[PDB]
Design a binder for this molecule. Structure first.
Ligand SMILES: [Cl-]
Lengths: 92, 81, 92, 87
């Protein structure tokens, strides 16, 4: 959901609007004098966005994902015992 | 309870480029906290990255998928500062 | 500047907090009980993030910026007269 | 944020190649925007970008965008990229 709301609609229901974006991808553009002034989103949503920004900026990101996706489809993956033994990082 | 964590061949290549202390930290996280709560330690990505998750740690980030049907986490890429 | 503030601090003071973010790059993480619930930012800051995401959706964006930056340092740039000539777009 | 004088606008080779991708009406609109409104108010028509793209600005008109840098000391704007997306 992508709601545009006056600040008067928010005031007094702050708990509820915060609860709503918190548990979802919803955003609220908050207007003041009819003009957008701020945006409210969930904390988890804000993190998702920051990490998306990070990853999209990395070189060969899409090619990486396509190659890793082809590994997944062929079973070219390694589990804990194999990785710990190849890289010399024993448990315990 | 804990998910089975796997590294793709692609992500394994990334591991080989890490300093040994960071390599060890990645391995301990991947088969520890990540295995226990992959939806808590990472976040789902958006736009064209929808379907993947990023876990940000001090010096490195892991890019991964979560397959709930088979209780598996698969690492796609490891990046390090 | 990221500030982390309890929701009890925001309540009844939402005008002032919206004013504080709309004019700046600052962000406020609003908590319930030390747990982050929502993030408030200025409308302009939100638009900056959305436009950054737009450009990051272009494959090879940072490499093409490195090439453009090398262009600038090398004098491979084109001014109005040359651009309007080549593309047949005269003034007025 | 107002500029006292119009900035000199320049296109990099990368941006010029982008212009070539556009059909003539859009190509002409971009050129008139770059040398008109963008020149006159390089800060007001765009937004600064963030994180790894910090230092660049994006200006949108309808379905096209220009990515650019501002050099205040030399009253110059340099266009790095032009993109058009019908949706
Ligand atoms: Cl990283």
């Amino acid at each position: 959901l992508m709601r545009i709301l006056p600040i008067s609609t928010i005031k007094g229901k702050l708990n509820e609007f915060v609860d709503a974006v918190s548990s979802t991808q919803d955003q609220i553009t908050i207007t003041k004098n009819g003009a957008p002034a701020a945006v409210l989103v969930g904390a988890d949503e804000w993190e998702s966005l920051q990490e998306t920004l990070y990853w999209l900026a990395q070189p060969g990101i899409r090619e990486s994902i396509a190659e890793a996706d082809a590994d997944i489809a062929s079973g070219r993956t390694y589990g804990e015992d194999e990785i710990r033994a190849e890289f010399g990082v024993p448990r315990r | 309870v804990p998910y089975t964590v796997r590294f793709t061949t692609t992500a394994r290549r990334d591991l080989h480029k890490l300093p040994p202390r960071i390599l060890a930290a990645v391995v301990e996280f991947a088969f520890g906290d990540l295995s226990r709560e992959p939806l808590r330690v990472g976040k789902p990505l958006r736009r064209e990255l929808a379907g993947t998750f990023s876990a940000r740690r001090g010096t490195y980030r892991l890019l991964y998928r979560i397959d709930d049907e088979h209780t598996t986490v698969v690492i796609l890429r490891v990046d390090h500062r």
